[PDB]
Swiss-Prot record, chains A, B:
Disulfide-bond pairs as recorded: C98-C195
GO cellular component, one term: cytoplasm
GO molecular function term, any single one: tRNA-uridine 2-sulfurtransferase activity
Binding site residues for ATP: G11, M12, S13, G14, G15, V16, D17, S18, M37, G122
The protein's name in its UniProt record: tRNA-specific 2-thiouridylase MnmA
Organism annotation: Streptococcus pneumoniae serotype 4 (strain ATCC BAA-334 / TIGR4)
Protein family according to the UniProt entry: Belongs to the MnmA/TRMU family.
Amino acid sequence: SDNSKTRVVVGMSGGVDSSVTALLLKEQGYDVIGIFMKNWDDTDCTATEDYKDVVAVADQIGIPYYSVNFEKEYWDRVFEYFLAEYRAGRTPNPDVMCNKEIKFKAFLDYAITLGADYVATGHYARVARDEDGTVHMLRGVDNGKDQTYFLSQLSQEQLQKTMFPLGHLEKPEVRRLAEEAGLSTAKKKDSTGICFIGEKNFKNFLSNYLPAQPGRMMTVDGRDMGEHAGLMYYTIGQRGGLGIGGDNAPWFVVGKDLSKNILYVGQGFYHDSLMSTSLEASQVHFTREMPEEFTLECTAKFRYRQPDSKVTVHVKGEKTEVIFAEPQRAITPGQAVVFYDGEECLGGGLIDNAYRDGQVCQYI
Amino acid sequence: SDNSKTRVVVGMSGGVDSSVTALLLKEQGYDVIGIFMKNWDDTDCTATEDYKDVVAVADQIGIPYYSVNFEKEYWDRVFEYFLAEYRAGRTPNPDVMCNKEIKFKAFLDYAITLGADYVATGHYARVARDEDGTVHMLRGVDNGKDQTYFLSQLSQEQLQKTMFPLGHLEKPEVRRLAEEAGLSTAKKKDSTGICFIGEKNFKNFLSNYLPAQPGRMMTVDGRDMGEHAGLMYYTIGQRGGLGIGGDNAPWFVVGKDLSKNILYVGQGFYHDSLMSTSLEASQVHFTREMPEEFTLECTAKFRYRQPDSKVTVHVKGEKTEVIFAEPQRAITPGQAVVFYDGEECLGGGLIDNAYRDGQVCQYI
Ligand SMILES: C[S@+](CC[C@H](N)C(=O)[O-])C[C@H]1O[C@@H](n2cnc3c(N)ncnc32)[C@H](O)[C@@H]1O
Ligand SMILES: C[S@+](CC[C@H](N)C(=O)[O-])C[C@H]1O[C@@H](n2cnc3c(N)ncnc32)[C@H](O)[C@@H]1O
Ligand SMILES: [Mg+2]
Ligand SMILES: [Mg+2]
């Protein structure tokens, strides 16, 4: 009856992570409520079979479960952001936006109306409380699944009401815990790609919302290489792609020019156009109150699947400058830059533009 | 017709990684042959539907495909190792053994009888050739999927005949490449866990081969906590487990004693029994010719899903000593220790035992 006085609302997606998150919290004696969000209307439906799994699991462990719909909020705060990024020639990170605006804003206020003390999710991340009571976010110990990158926008006030029960676990353990508990989701494979596109063709999906305007593909010396399918189908640094058959060696996307509808391509993983020495970022947000203007010597991640690297960051309110210790490959406008201090995730922003020798890279 | 003179035999498992590995090599003009290994007899069969995918993909890209059976070799060189580890109270890494003895020995010699110049696999790793022509292994750029850890045992002579076409790719890209090529495996989810156990219950699997002898579960101060199911069902550091319901806080496995059939358990992620300051390792193997006796200041990984950490290693032929810069949690006998020099994977061994203050940890 210690933890039984603490109500935790757990986001239950129907996956093995959230199923295990719920089981662990129940086992620790918390007052646990499972909640399924339907945030996307995808009918031939996807949400229907996942809700079945939420129900089967919630019943297996004996917790209440409910179902809430945030289609509107998700559309307005995530999907419009997603589309507007593409219109601007950038590459969005809808998950960052989703955590910031949905999982820890809409869902958190919702959970509070259920008398929740905390929300929990199956994110691979940790929260540590200070002596002072200040909460810090730490990388998940599973350094392949560590989701702090996507949680970079969370505020002190959100982290105060958050729990991450999987934070000290590695993915295979989560599956072992599920199997030993006999949870029906134990063997359920995780959905890949963005939630709302699911297992549908990406080009087809996006073209339902944005007009694709094929344009010209060029090498850096100006030689026309054919037609691309629309710039929003390519990202800085990508190997091959729609109509990139272009020598046997592969071609990469090495720049973009939205204003001429041009895709720049070139050979070599380390193509000189792919290298940067600094960036600017917007929407820079920290996990705690920071000064108006300050310098930081830390590490950063520019993409989810890379190790972090040394960085000087100069913050000045509306814009942030990031200087790389070492040249960086394929720094992508729209993606998240996330700052670390060893195991602590300090916060992050969205990349506006890359620079090499005091001149904006033609990335777009 | 440049690369068309180079024959590459690609290991095709039926998964999206190997499918894409084959497509990329074909696209680059290599003389490509896809080969499926059946190494485990698992009938109600698993191999049957995967071979269908190999065939569908090989036909989609227009390469020849064949099928070879190494059940014997796999049993003898991997599965017996796996079982013998458990009998000895250790935790095996069958993948390390499998790459060393099967994918790059049995399969490589096989491929050579097909006039192969190289074997390729869909491992997330890189090989770089020196000025001198010496090959080094580099981490995959996808730092979550990077498989150098499992490839730590590969010799210079194996790496000379190896290609890793996915080495410069991240997993989501591999899926985008697959989808754009219209490969039937594009949406196919990767199988989790060890190959031969697949989606069957682990406890059930292992008990078909090893007698489980339940024994006593004890805290570090000697208090009997109940019966465990058999020591081979638990690993150093694991949270909960079979019969670990044991306060609301979770219990961890903090040691083992095979000689008394005892499982030691304790509360707290950082339980003092979980911390080590050094280890010894056997089967230490490097990617290049090394001296008989030498010191190395580098980093190491003690488990697949952790970042590497600073380490002094003293090598002396039969045994290797590893001294941690910082105390290490749940150092597990039988697991791989793998050494790095920045992005280079130097080699590795199998952990024999952990030490704290010149005394072997009771891990077993
Ligand atoms: C799998 S998502 C993480 C993927 C991505 N990196 C991100 O941050 O969105 C992590 C957690 O969010 C919560 N979640 C995701 N979808 C949900 C849904 N439809 N309803 C309730 N919770 C959900 C679950 O607790 C889940 O374990
Ligand atoms: C998915 S396995 C990697 C998993 C594990 N970390 C390891 O090293 O074994 C990597 C590659 O091995 C090859 N491979 C695995 N199973 C195979 C099979 N049955 N037949 C042929 N190749 C296989 C494929 O090329 C595959 O992409
Ligand atoms: Mg989940
Ligand atoms: Mg594969």
